[PDB]
């Protein structure tokens, strides 16, 4: 509860309003936020119907020990031109400095702005204090459905409500403007797979080897490798994720790899960088890919597929057995501005 | 140089005859790297007789033979078919220990009592 009053002094003047937010364990258990004191939070908001990017601000978070209980934060709210937008996502990115951890937690302003609604010279000494009392108002997250609390601290103030500027006609429907990200990334994945299937047709519905791996001679194994490709087309199309490898490659300034979990046997680990490997496509460059410990297991093993994305937005789908199909993400110049603004 | 030399008699034993004669052979291998033609010269040391070492050299270069001839399913040029050649650089006496040295490091063997006897190149494949 000290973490609210610290941010009013140092995050405060760099913002317009702060959304003082306390996250209970029920919200923490869903997103798997392991409360160590080393975690460095960072916040930025993704605008709608405007050029969407704001500056990243580092926000202090402290665990509250016990009347709720959970992680305490403070989210920045940005009023460009004197008013708030209702459909405007405030993104929280959770990461550790040393170890490998990256989480994205997103909040919408209508779940925040609504919840805010109810002689020697003397030197001034203003310490940080928890003297101000909290008012705890309920909220539910739109994206996961897990409850979190919002603090409203006591201080043309009581006369007005907090401003909003609702969107105007013509408009997409608000279930499709809320998930503006998950409907843009999904149609870049559904058009990526249509390039992978197009390479089968120009070859004659075949899968050719690329990686020298000896395959045991059994007829049931040769029919099982084909089943890993068709399962990989069910997973790449359903995948609409903020942290995919091709978003990391488009916002890069290095091969970006993401392994999949076929038949839901594994959760996905996305955006792994292949440092020291230049995916030129020559046969001497696949030895540097095989020196990675993941591709030795996505190929010798089973039930895991693997996608390796070049910085030129060309990607191979690596199957077990060394079979691969070159595919291409098509990103126009208008969409690179849309991606490098909101994500990079 | 210790890098170029490839020994040939090496066993756990897991028994071979002794003799008076162990012969250093040279080899020179035509290959292609980065779609550009290039050579590779290695050395061999064994007293097994010429009928075994040509079969022992082919087992050493098994991988390099296969990765070249994957190309000529598409283009068959009779000039490209020649692969390697083996000379005989002269004899070494049996049980002379090659003494390791190091120079600037560069590890470099040395052979006592080496006597030279040049031979022709015979084209193995």
């Amino acid at each position: 509860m000290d973490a609210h009053a610290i941010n009013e002094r140092y995050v405060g003047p760099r913002c317009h309003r702060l959304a003082h937010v306390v996250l209970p364990r029920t919200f923490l258990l869903h997103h798997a936020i392991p409360l160590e004191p080393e975690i460095i939070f960072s916040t930025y908001t993704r605008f709608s119907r405007s050029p969407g990017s704001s500056r990243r601000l580092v926000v202090c978070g402290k665990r509250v020990l016990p009347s709720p209980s959970g992680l305490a934060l403070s989210l920045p709210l940005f009023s460009h031109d004197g008013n708030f937008h209702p459909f405007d996502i405030s993104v929280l990115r959770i990461s550790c400095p040393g170890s490998n951890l990256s989480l994205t937690v997103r909040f919408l302003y209508l779940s925040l702005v609504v919840a805010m609604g109810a002689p020697p010279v003397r030197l001034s000494f203003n310490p940080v204090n928890a003297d101000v009392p909290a008012t705890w108002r309920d909220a539910t997250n739109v994206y996961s459905g897990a409850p979190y609390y919002v603090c409203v601290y006591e201080r043309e103030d009581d006369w007005l409500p907090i401003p909003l500027s609702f969107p105007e006609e013509p408009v997409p429907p608000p279930p499709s403007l809320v998930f503006m990200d998950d409907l843009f990334i999904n149609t870049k994945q559904c058009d990526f797979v249509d390039t992978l299937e197009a390479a089968c047709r120009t070859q004659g519905y075949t899968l050719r080897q690329r990686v020298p791996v000896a395959i045991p001679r059994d007829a049931e194994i040769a029919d099982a490798v084909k089943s890993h490709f068709l399962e990989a087309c069910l997973v790449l199309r359903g995948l609409a994720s903020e942290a995919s490898a091709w978003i990391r490659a488009a916002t890069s300034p290095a091969c970006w790899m993401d392994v999949l979990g076929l038949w839901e046997s594994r959760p996905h680990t996305l955006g792994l960088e292949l440092r020291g490997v230049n995916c030129g496509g020559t046969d001497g460059d696949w030895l540097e890919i095989l020196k990675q410990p993941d591709v030795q297991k996505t190929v010798s093993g089973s039930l895991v597929a693997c996608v390796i994305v070049t910085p030129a937005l060309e990607a191979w789908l690596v199957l077990p057995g060394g079979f691969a199909i070159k595919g291409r993400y098509r990103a126009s110049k208008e969409d690179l501005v849309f991606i490098r603004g909101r994500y990079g | 140089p210790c890098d170029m030399l490839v020994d040939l008699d090496e066993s756990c034993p897991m028994r071979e005859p002794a003799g008076l004669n162990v012969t250093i052979y040279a080899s020179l291998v035509y290959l292609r790297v980065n779609q550009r033609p290039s050579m590779a010269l290695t050395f061999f040391q064994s007293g097994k007789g010429f009928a075994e070492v040509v079969a022992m050299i082919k087992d050493h270069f098994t991988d390099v033979i296969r990765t070249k001839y994957i190309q000529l399913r598409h283009e068959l040029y009779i000039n490209r078919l020649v692969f390697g050649a083996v000379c005989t650089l002269g004899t070494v006496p049996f049980d002379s220990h090659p003494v390791h040295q190091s120079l600037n490091s560069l590890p470099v063997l040395v052979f006592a009592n080496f006597e030279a006897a040049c031979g022709p190149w015979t084209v193995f494949l």
């Binding site: 559904c190 519905y205 000896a214 068709l230 087309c233 069910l234 199309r237 079979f323 | -």
Partner: peptide, 29 residues
């Protein structure tokens, strides 16, 4: 016995089971 690695090793994919798989990915999206 194993199969030897070679860049002409092919696996012929059926046309119907690639399209019946395409029907499933429509529904789960």
């Amino acid at each position: 016995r194993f199969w030897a690695p070679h860049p002409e090793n092919v696996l012929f994919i059926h046309k119907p089971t690639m399209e019946e798989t395409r029907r499933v990915a429509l529904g789960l999206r």
